[PDB]
Amino acid sequence: AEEMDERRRQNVAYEYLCHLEEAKRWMEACLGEDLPPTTELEEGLRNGVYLAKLGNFFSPKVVSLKKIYDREQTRYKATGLHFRHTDNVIQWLNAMDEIGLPKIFYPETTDIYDRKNMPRCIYCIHALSLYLFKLGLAPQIQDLYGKVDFTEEEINNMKTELEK
Amino acid sequence: AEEMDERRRQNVAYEYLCHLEEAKRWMEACLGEDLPPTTELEEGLRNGVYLAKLGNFFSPKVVSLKKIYDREQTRYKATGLHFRHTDNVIQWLNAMDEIGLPKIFYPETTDIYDRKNMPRCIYCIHALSLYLFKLGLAPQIQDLYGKVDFTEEEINNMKTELEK
Numbered sequence: 001a002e003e004m005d006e007r008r009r010q011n012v013a014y015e016y017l018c019h020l021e022e023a024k025r026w027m028e029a030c031l032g033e034d035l036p037p038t039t040e041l042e043e044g045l046r047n048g049v050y051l052a053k054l055g056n057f058f059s060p061k062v063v064s065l066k067k068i069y070d071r072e073q074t075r076y077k078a079t080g081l082h083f084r085h086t087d088n089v090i091q092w093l094n095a096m097d098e099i100g101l102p103k104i105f106y107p108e109t110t111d112i113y114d115r116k117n118m119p120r121c122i123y124c125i126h127a128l129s130l131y132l133f134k135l136g137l138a139p140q141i142q143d144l145y146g147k148v149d150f151t152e153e154e155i156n157n158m159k160t161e162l163e164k
Numbered sequence: 165a166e167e168m169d170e171r172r173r174q175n176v177a178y179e180y181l182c183h184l185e186e187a188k189r190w191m192e193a194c195l196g197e198d199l200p201p202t203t204e205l206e207e208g209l210r211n212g213v214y215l216a217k218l219g220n221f222f223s224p225k226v227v228s229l230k231k232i233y234d235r236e237q238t239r240y241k242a243t244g245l246h247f248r249h250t251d252n253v254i255q256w257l258n259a260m261d262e263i264g265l266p267k268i269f270y271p272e273t274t275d276i277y278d279r280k281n282m283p284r285c286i287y288c289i290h291a292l293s294l295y296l297f298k299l300g301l302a303p304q305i306q307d308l309y310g311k312v313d314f315t316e317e318e319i320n321n322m323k324t325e326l327e328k
Contacts, residue, residue: 019268103309104183104290126268127291134298143266 013158016119018144023125026141030057039154042118047076048088051112054125055095058137062098063091086113096124101131177323180283182308187289190305194221203318206282211240212252215276215285218292219259222301226262227255250277260288265295283326 021038028035031053036044045051049071055063068091069084070076076085089109096106105127111117132138185202192199195217200208209215213234219227232255233248234240240249253273260270269291271284296302 102290102294102305102307104287123268123287126266127294130266130291130295131298134295141266145267 009159009163010155013155013162014150015145016122016162017150017154017158018148019122019126021148022142022144023122023129026129026139027054027125029139030054039150039157042115042122045112045118045121046115047073047081047085048090048092048112049073049076049085051092052088052095054128055092058132059095059098063095067091081113089113096128099131099135099137101128173323173327174319177319177326178314179309180286180326181314181318181322182312183286183290185312186305186308187286187293189308190293190303191218191289193303194218203314203321206279206286209276209282209285210279211237211245211249212254212256212276213237213240213249215256216252218289219256222296223259223262226259231255245277253277260292263295263299263301265292 017038020041024035024038024041027050031050035041035050047070049068052063052068053065056065056068065071069087070082075082086109089112093106093109097103105124107117107120107124112121126141129138129141133140181202184205188199188202188205191214195214199205199214211234213232216227216232217229217235220229220232229235233251234246239246250273253276257270257273261267269288271281271288275281276285290305293302293305297304
């Protein structure tokens with residue numbers, strides 16, 4: 001009975017990993033390049049490069065690839081996050097505003113850059129996917145709730161990450 | 165400078181009130197009846213009656229108006245929530261699953277019944293609205309961010325509610 005609030009927690013972690021995995025595959029399907037491992041996707045979206053590319057994918061008229069800061073992430077891999085990376089997240093936000101995705105789904109720059117609330121970012125990706133799909137601008141995102149598994153260590157890691 | 169994290173907080177509350185107002189009007193537009201005041205909408209969705217009605221509106225195959233418990237909410241007005249109201253929320257959930265709304269957006273029964281996380285409910289309504297609109301089953305939800313105002317007292321009440 002007391003272990004219920006300890007197993008339900010395991011479930012949340014698992015479900016979030018599935019949603020992450022789904023976001024990862026869909027972005028890859030759209031971008032045509034590999035994204036970091038599902039287990040490291042959150043940290044891998046922080047510099048906003050992938051998001052800005054996603055923006056270019058559906059709203060090219062608003063997000064030019066040549067104007068993305070550290071497009072190859074060489075700077076990021078080398079020194080880490082830089083204040084200028086924030087512009088990338090903003091380009092993505094502008095991309096979504098251009099195509100009509102309702103703002104209630106938008107995360108704040110800090111939510112992704114300072115990783116204050118990455119889940120909010122994932123949820124937005126998912127909503128953007130549903131919106132893009134209905135406009136016939138991107139493939140449908142997958143649903144992997146039960147077809148995908150993760151090691152006990154990964155669920156455990158995600159669990160503690162979703163708490164403290 | 166210290167009042168920034170106290171004004172930004174005011175903004176969040178305001179934004180949420182706008183989202184609630186938008187969900188309220190859209191549901192009314194779909195249902196053809198009045199819903200409680202935007203300021204009391206959250207508490208007013210707890211018994212799931214309006215949600216089940218929303219369910220019947222887009223998936224009558226799954227939700228029969230006659231199988232909604234306390235459809236007139238007479239029980240509710242008399243005595244508060246009753247365990248049997250939980251079924252209404254569940255009918256709404258089944259409605260969404262039937263039309264194919266991605267599960268990532270679904271709140272848990274407890275989130276709305278025990279009011280553990282009503283915002284999750286509101287965000288789901290918005291995703292549902294976006295989806296239903298693309299299916300041509302319902303009118304488009306409005307964007308009221310700037311067009312609408314609330315009293316200071318209301319912004320304030322919502323603010324403290326969104327914290328402790």
